[PDB]
Design an enzyme around this catalytic site. Structure first.
Site, PDB file in Angstrom:
ATOM      1  N   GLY B   9      13.288 -65.552  22.059  1.00 56.04           N
ATOM      2  CA  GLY B   9      13.580 -64.777  20.862  1.00 56.04           C
ATOM      3  C   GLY B   9      14.650 -63.748  21.146  1.00 56.04           C
ATOM      4  O   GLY B   9      14.691 -63.214  22.247  1.00 56.04           O
ATOM      5  N   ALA B  11      14.941 -60.694  20.600  1.00 58.39           N
ATOM      6  CA  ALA B  11      14.308 -59.543  21.225  1.00 58.39           C
ATOM      7  C   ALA B  11      13.925 -59.810  22.674  1.00 58.39           C
ATOM      8  O   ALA B  11      14.403 -59.140  23.582  1.00 58.39           O
ATOM      9  CB  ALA B  11      13.102 -59.148  20.439  1.00 58.39           C
ATOM     10  N   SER B 112       6.338 -62.408  22.445  1.00 57.89           N
ATOM     11  CA  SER B 112       5.334 -61.695  21.664  1.00 57.89           C
ATOM     12  C   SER B 112       4.084 -62.546  21.459  1.00 57.89           C
ATOM     13  O   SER B 112       4.111 -63.761  21.655  1.00 57.89           O
ATOM     14  CB  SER B 112       5.910 -61.270  20.311  1.00 57.89           C
ATOM     15  N   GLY B 116       5.143 -67.463  15.235  1.00 62.66           N
ATOM     16  CA  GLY B 116       5.287 -68.899  15.082  1.00 62.66           C
ATOM     17  C   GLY B 116       5.508 -69.604  16.405  1.00 62.66           C
ATOM     18  O   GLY B 116       4.754 -70.505  16.773  1.00 62.66           O
ATOM     19  N   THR B 117       6.549 -69.193  17.122  1.00 62.85           N
ATOM     20  CA  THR B 117       6.873 -69.788  18.413  1.00 62.85           C
ATOM     21  C   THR B 117       6.232 -69.008  19.556  1.00 62.85           C
ATOM     22  O   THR B 117       6.377 -69.370  20.725  1.00 62.85           O
ATOM     23  CB  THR B 117       8.395 -69.854  18.639  1.00 62.85           C
ATOM     24  N   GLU B 225      -0.903 -60.816  45.477  1.00 60.42           N
ATOM     25  CA  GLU B 225      -1.629 -59.553  45.616  1.00 60.42           C
ATOM     26  C   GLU B 225      -2.262 -59.150  44.299  1.00 60.42           C
ATOM     27  O   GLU B 225      -3.464 -58.894  44.228  1.00 60.42           O
ATOM     28  CB  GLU B 225      -0.683 -58.436  46.053  1.00 60.42           C
TER      29      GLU B 225
HETATM   30  N1  LIG Z   1      12.558 -54.904  22.734  1.00 61.41           N
HETATM   31  C1  LIG Z   1      13.429 -55.667  22.145  1.00 61.41           C
HETATM   32  N2  LIG Z   1      13.128 -56.284  21.001  1.00 61.41           N
HETATM   33  C2  LIG Z   1      14.156 -57.047  20.511  1.00 61.41           C
HETATM   34  C3  LIG Z   1      15.432 -57.217  21.062  1.00 61.41           C
HETATM   35  N3  LIG Z   1      16.200 -58.050  20.284  1.00 61.41           N
HETATM   36  C4  LIG Z   1      15.424 -58.369  19.285  1.00 61.41           C
HETATM   37  N4  LIG Z   1      14.171 -57.806  19.360  1.00 61.41           N
HETATM   38  C5  LIG Z   1      13.067 -57.965  18.400  1.00 61.41           C
HETATM   39  O1  LIG Z   1      12.723 -59.359  18.349  1.00 61.41           O
HETATM   40  C6  LIG Z   1      12.761 -59.821  16.973  1.00 61.41           C
HETATM   41  C7  LIG Z   1      14.070 -60.475  16.673  1.00 61.41           C
HETATM   42  O2  LIG Z   1      14.155 -61.861  16.955  1.00 61.41           O
HETATM   43  P1  LIG Z   1      15.625 -62.501  16.588  1.00 61.41           P
HETATM   44  O3  LIG Z   1      16.695 -61.839  17.358  1.00 61.41           O
HETATM   45  O4  LIG Z   1      15.756 -62.437  15.105  1.00 61.41           O
HETATM   46  O5  LIG Z   1      15.473 -63.970  16.973  1.00 61.41           O
HETATM   47  P2  LIG Z   1      15.334 -64.753  18.279  1.00 61.41           P
HETATM   48  O6  LIG Z   1      13.850 -64.660  18.588  1.00 61.41           O
HETATM   49  O7  LIG Z   1      16.284 -64.331  19.300  1.00 61.41           O
HETATM   50  O8  LIG Z   1      15.596 -66.322  17.853  1.00 61.41           O
HETATM   51  P3  LIG Z   1      16.325 -66.853  16.459  1.00 61.41           P
HETATM   52  O9  LIG Z   1      15.512 -66.468  15.227  1.00 61.41           O
HETATM   53  O10 LIG Z   1      16.431 -68.381  16.368  1.00 61.41           O
HETATM   54  O11 LIG Z   1      17.678 -66.177  16.495  1.00 61.41           O
HETATM   55  C8  LIG Z   1      12.640 -58.581  16.119  1.00 61.41           C
HETATM   56  O12 LIG Z   1      11.282 -58.269  15.914  1.00 61.41           O
HETATM   57  C9  LIG Z   1      13.379 -57.548  16.956  1.00 61.41           C
HETATM   58  O13 LIG Z   1      12.883 -56.242  16.647  1.00 61.41           O
HETATM   59  C10 LIG Z   1      15.734 -56.555  22.253  1.00 61.41           C
HETATM   60  O14 LIG Z   1      16.795 -56.609  22.868  1.00 61.41           O
HETATM   61  N5  LIG Z   1      14.660 -55.785  22.753  1.00 61.41           N
END
Ligand SMILES: Nc1nc2c(ncn2[C@@H]2O[C@H](COP(=O)(O)OP(=O)(O)OP(=O)(O)O)[C@@H](O)[C@H]2O)c(=O)[nH]1
Ligand SMILES: Nc1nc2c(ncn2[C@@H]2O[C@H](COP(=O)(O)OP(=O)(O)OP(=O)(O)O)[C@@H](O)[C@H]2O)c(=O)[nH]1
Ligand SMILES: [Mg+2]
Ligand SMILES: [Mg+2]
Lengths: 411, 409
Positions: B9, B11, B112, B116-117, B225
């Site tokens: 994802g 994030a 997370s 879904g995934t 460990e």
């Molecule tokens: N901690 C953290 N959360 C992030 C970061 N980038 C995105 N998120 C969180 O992860 C989710 C975003 O997922 P997306 O970037 O939309 O999608 P993806 O999971 O990369 O995959 P696609 O939908 O196919 O692009 C949101 O809830 C964001 O708040 C990051 O760099 N750090």
């Protein structure tokens, strides 16, 4: 994934021009030009709406259906009008009988449609976008889906209002929308004017506008959710959270920042301002007023960086200040959705998709009007005389009316 | 010995780039050194591209940077069965290709819990692991939280991930759910904590796990460990991550906090990246990983003081449950984020009776959804059955009893 837009009629067409006017810029596609995209992300997913031929010519994959040349010849002779491949322009007695366009007259033209709906699908297909109380509408269109759903989803953007048998053509089509369609964003021509002449001091609301406003909502719905988000959804979520009972049920879309140009640009869009908006009577593209009947489901599909707290929170008070109308047998009617990137030029927006009521308080309406006039077969001769059935109207009203009962099963 | 990692994802990838940064940073391996040991998945190119365009560009193999081309769907079923299936093979392949190159221990997944995934997929990923390698499936999530859920279905996706996760997911570090925010509000002060800010944090606590630990020190602690000194029972037990010097690099200045303060500030009920406040949960094993300038006596004292606070009640069947991990190199804060930047920290993780909660609260959600089948037709129609749900519910049930028995008594 993919989808194939459908510009039925003039309105649905006029709006096409606005839905594509937008979307393109939200994808850096100039008239016939290619991807000028300020970024690189507005391209990895375009396919959903275009096709690769030349290498600079990603052509919108929609259909332009209309029996009035002048129209499409206004959309094709203006701005972005020269991006649609001519093949896209699809320019009997169209009797105003639901049975005339579903069993006798339409049933013939169907195969020559499905033919294309396959040529476009096999352009993986997701569904089709459709912009646009009669024959070619309720009957023949309600068939088009019953066939589609046997062969992808079907979002419908309707400009709900003008006829006499109305409840006949209606009850009969809602019925089909229970086992066929499953996603309508019930927008409208006079609910729009209003919302467009008083919520936009706009004094000369041309059709292009109305259409434009509508197209604004159908973009927030679909396309939008096909973007990232803290909490994203997609047609199904929207469907699987909004339809308590199989009728298919119809919604009523509402956009968020709907402020007049210059002045109004108040920016009061922290968020309580968007829910303030979305949840008021006026501002519901539908004709009816929510305040006149509970809700079964609601889907605030926001799209602009905000606090999953000030979002998830607001929704609540809203659910308590109006406990009255919000149905109870659903602890949390609201379906909060949250994209990230907002409408190109805006800071924060939120599409609203409301599901009417369980004491179905709209299909009830419709269904009532039917019976009150069906009982006397009012303007029925215009249907039957067009090759219809006395059992066809019965069917629809019964099938459509049942939806209200099932929807209540959750209220 | 090793532990692959799959950042899924956008994030999980942003947080990934972060946790991945802190790493080299405390291992003296600049931009272009060795070779990572993880992968990157996303169905939106532009984001993984950021790892292909921005910093730490050439520290990866365009092979451990994948994307996709399908639909997510905030529904278990689809992600587990129907769609998610198609990818799994390929997925596995890497955790079998990356597992070979190294006797590994597991895959630290970054995405997370509910989703879904995140729910579905993994369900079968951890599923296919327990049979292949029997290994560890610790998924590091950025989720909720109870009253502030996001997805409308969330519970459906949780109750399903728990049951099929019982043998799939061993321990889910359930941070960022909503308790990490508190830390951003109460222990750093900031109402605008972008998802990027939350990751920098786990991006920290994680750096304390692998990075520095796999790095020489005065009291090294191998990955094995952990599980050994950290899990009392086969349930892929889920400890909680906690960090100590979570002070603001601008607000206060209470930096110089002797080891006799950073340790205790890891016990309070408002600094643990998890809304599982020791509401009763008796700890049963803690792995105090320290880093920076720390005198073993300082620890073998600061901990002694704790062992006798009693209000911190440790399990019965456990005399001493304190794995003291000492590293040398102090932490390494982002040049200009919002993290203080002290010269010593305490990333203490542990099995408290306490996820007894978090699991509970997440299980109940499923019962509510399943009790009505809610989005069930979405999975069934995807090669699942009333079995997998009901039989994965019963699964976690004995995870609510497990995390209860191994403690409170
Ligand atoms: N901690 C953290 N959360 C992030 C970061 N980038 C995105 N998120 C969180 O992860 C989710 C975003 O997922 P997306 O970037 O939309 O999608 P993806 O999971 O990369 O995959 P696609 O939908 O196919 O692009 C949101 O809830 C964001 O708040 C990051 O760099 N750090
Ligand atoms: N927004 C918008 N609404 C329109 C436009 N044109 C018509 N409408 C609305 O759509 C409805 C009119 O449908 P008609 O033009 O009568 O019929 P049609 O659907 O094109 O098909 P036929 O009845 O067979 O001619 C009314 O409710 C109008 O207010 C338009 O350009 N924009
Ligand atoms: Mg017409
Ligand atoms: Mg992405």
């Amino acid at each position: 994934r993919e989808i194939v837009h459908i510009q039925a009629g003039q309105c649905g067409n006029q709006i096409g021009a606005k839905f594509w006017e937008v979307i393109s810029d939200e994808h850096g596609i100039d008239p016939t030009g290619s991807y000028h995209g300020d970024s690189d992300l507005q391209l990895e997913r375009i396919n959903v709406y275009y096709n690769e031929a030349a290498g600079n010519k990603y052509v919108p994959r929609a259909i332009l259906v209309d029996l009035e040349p002048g129209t499409m010849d206004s959309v094709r002779s203006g701005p972005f009008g020269q991006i649609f491949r001519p093949d896209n322009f699809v320019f009997s007695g169209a009797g105003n009988n639901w049975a005339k366009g579903h069993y006798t007259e339409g049933a013939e033209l169907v195969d020559s449609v499905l033919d294309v709906v396959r040529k476009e699908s096999e352009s993986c297909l997701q569904g089709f976008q459709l912009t646009h109380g009669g024959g070619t509408g309720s009957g023949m269109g309600t068939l088009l889906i019953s066939k589609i759903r046997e062969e992808r989803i079907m979002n419908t953007f309707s400009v709900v209002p003008d006829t006499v048998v109305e409840p006949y053509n209606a009850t009969l089509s809602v019925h089909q929308l229970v086992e066929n369609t499953d996603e309508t964003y019930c927008i409208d021509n006079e609910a729009l004017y209003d919302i467009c002449f008083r919520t936009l001091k706009l004094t000369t609301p041309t059709y292009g506008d109305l259409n434009h406003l509508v197209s604004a909502t159908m973009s927030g719905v679909t396309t939008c959710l096909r973007f990232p988000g803290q909490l994203n959804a997609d047609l199904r979520k929207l469907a699987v959270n909004m339809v308590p009972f199989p009728r298919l049920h119809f919604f009523m879309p509402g956009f968020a920042p709907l402020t007049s140009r210059g002045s109004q640009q108040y920016r009061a869009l922290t968020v309580p301002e968007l829910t303030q908006q979305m949840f008021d009577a006026k501002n519901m593209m539908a004709a009816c007023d929510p305040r006149h009947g509970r809700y079964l489901t609601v889907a605030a599909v926001f799209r602009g960086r905000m606090s999953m707290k000030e979002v998830d929170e607001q929704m609540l008070n809203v659910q308590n200040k109006n406990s009255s109308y919000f149905v109870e047998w659903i602890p949390n009617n609201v379906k909060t959705a949250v994209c990230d990137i907002p409408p190109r030029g805006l800071k924060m927006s939120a599409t609203f998709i409301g599901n009417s009521t369980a004491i179905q308080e709209l299909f009830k309406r419709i269904s009532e009007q039917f019976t009150a006039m069906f009982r006397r077969k009012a303007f029925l001769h215009w249907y039957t005389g067009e090759g219809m059935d006395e059992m066809e109207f019965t069917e629809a009203e019964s099938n459509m009316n049942d939806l209200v009962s099932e929807y209540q099963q959750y209220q | 010995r090793e532990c692959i990692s799959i950042h899924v994802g956008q994030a999980g990838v942003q947080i990934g780039n972060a946790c991945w940064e802190l790493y080299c940073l405390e291992h003296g391996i600049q931009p272009d050194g060795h070779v990572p040991r993880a992968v990157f998945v996303d169905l939106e190119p532009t984001v993984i591209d950021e790892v292909r365009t921005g910093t730490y560009r050439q520290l990866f193999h365009p092979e451990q940077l994948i994307t996709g081309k399908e639909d997510a769907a905030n529904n278990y079923a689809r992600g587990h069965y129907t769609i998610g299936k198609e990818i799994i093979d390929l997925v596995l392949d890497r955790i079998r290709k990356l597992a070979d190159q190294c006797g590994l221990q597991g895959f630290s997944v970054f995405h997370s819990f509910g989703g879904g995934t995140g729910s579905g997929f993994t369900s079968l990923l951890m599923e296919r692991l327990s049979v292949d390698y029997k290994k560890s499936k610790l998924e590091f999530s950025i989720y909720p939280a109870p009253q502030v859920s996001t997805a409308v279905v969330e519970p459906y996706n949780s109750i399903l991930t728990t049951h099929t996760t019982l043998e799939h997911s061993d321990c889910a570090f359930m941070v960022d759910n909503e308790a990490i925010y508190d830390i951003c509000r109460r222990n750093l002060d900031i109402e605008r904590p972008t998802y990027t800010n939350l990751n920098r944090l786990i991006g920290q606590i994680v750096s304390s796990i692998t990075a520095s630990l796999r790095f020489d020190g005065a009291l090294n602690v191998d990955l094995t460990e952990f599980q050994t000194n950290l899990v009392p029972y086969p349930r892929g037990h889920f400890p909680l991550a906690t960090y100590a010097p979570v002070i603001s690099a601008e607000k206060a200045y209470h930096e110089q906090l002797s080891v006799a303060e950073i340790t205790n500030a890891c016990f309070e009920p408002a600094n643990q990246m998890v809304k599982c406040d020791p509401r009763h949960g008796k700890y049963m094993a803690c792995c105090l990983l320290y880093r920076g300038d720390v005198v073993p006596k300082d620890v073998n004292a600061a901990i002694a003081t704790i062992k006798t606070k009693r209000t911190i009640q440790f399990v019965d069947w456990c005399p001493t449950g304190f794995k003291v991990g000492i590293n040398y190199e102090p932490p390494t804060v982002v040049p200009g984020g919002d993290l203080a930047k002290v010269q010593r920290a305490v990333c203490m993780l542990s099995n408290t009776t306490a996820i007894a909660e978090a699991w509970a609260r997440l299980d109940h959600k499923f019962d509510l959804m399943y009790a009505k089948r809610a989005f069930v037709h979405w999975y069934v129609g995807e090669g699942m059955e009333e079995g997998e749900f009901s039989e994965a519910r019963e699964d976690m049930a004995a995870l609510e009893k497990d995390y209860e028995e191994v403690g409170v008594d």
